[PDB]
């Protein structure tokens, strides 16, 4: 009946993480702690509206928060984090149980420095 209303390619543009799944897993827990309000607002938007076209402005804030988080890590705890997610990437299913020592190093580095 009515013409659908897809957003334009221009407004579907945002700076994107471009970091691999292993990296995201390694950063997950602290990324779940910090960057909670932003993600939760976006998620409530998704569930309440049910329309993906109506939560884009909040999703882009999600992306910005993720970029800020990862920039901070890259600025301070970069090398321990690289070690940690290398060890994770090696694992077949990216299981945490295999890299606990490097996880401890990274966790201590972030806890003190940041």
Q: At its nearest, how many Å lie between other proteins and the CB of residue 103?
A: 11
Rounded to a whole number of angstroms, the minimum distance from the CB of residue 112 to other proteins is 18
- Least distance to other proteins, CB of residue 53, Å: 7
* Residue among 36 and 108 whose Cβ is closer to other proteins: 36
**H or E, element range at 66:** helix 56-75
Pick between residue 94 and residue 105 the one whose CB is nearest to other proteins.
Answer: 94
What is the contact surface with other proteins in residues (CB under 8 A)? 1-9, 12, 14, 16-25, 28-29, 31-33, 36-37, 39-40, 42-44, 46-48, 50-53, 55-56, 59-60, 62-63, 66, 70, 73-74, 78, 81-82, 85, 89-98
Retrieve residue 107's tokens.
Answer: 């966790």
Minimum CB distance to other proteins smaller for 5 or for 112: 5
Q: Scanning the structure block, which residue is given the tokens 């579907």? A: 12
Q: Which is nearer to other proteins, 39 or 107 (CB)?
A: 39
Question: Is 102 in contact with 83 (CB distance < 8 Å)?
Answer: yes
**Strand (E) or helix (H) holding 83:** helix 78-90
Give the distance between the most distant pair of CA atoms in the chain. 60
> b/e string for 12-22 if b means 16 or more Cβ within 10 A?
eeeeeeeeeeb
């Amino acid at each position: 009946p009515g013409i659908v209303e897809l957003p334009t390619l221009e407004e579907l543009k945002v700076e994107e993480v471009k970091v691999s799944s292993a990296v995201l897993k390694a950063a997950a827990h602290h990324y779940g702690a910090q960057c909670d309000k932003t993600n939760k607002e976006f998620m409530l938007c998704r569930w309440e509206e049910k329309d993906p076209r109506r939560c884009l402005k909040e999703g882009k804030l999600v992306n910005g928060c993720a970029l800020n988080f990862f920039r901070q890590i890259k600025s301070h705890c970069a090398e321990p984090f690289t070690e940690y997610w290398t060890c994770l990437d090696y694992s077949n299913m990216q299981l945490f149980r295999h890299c606990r020592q490097q996880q401890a190093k990274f966790d201590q580095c972030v806890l003190d420095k940041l």
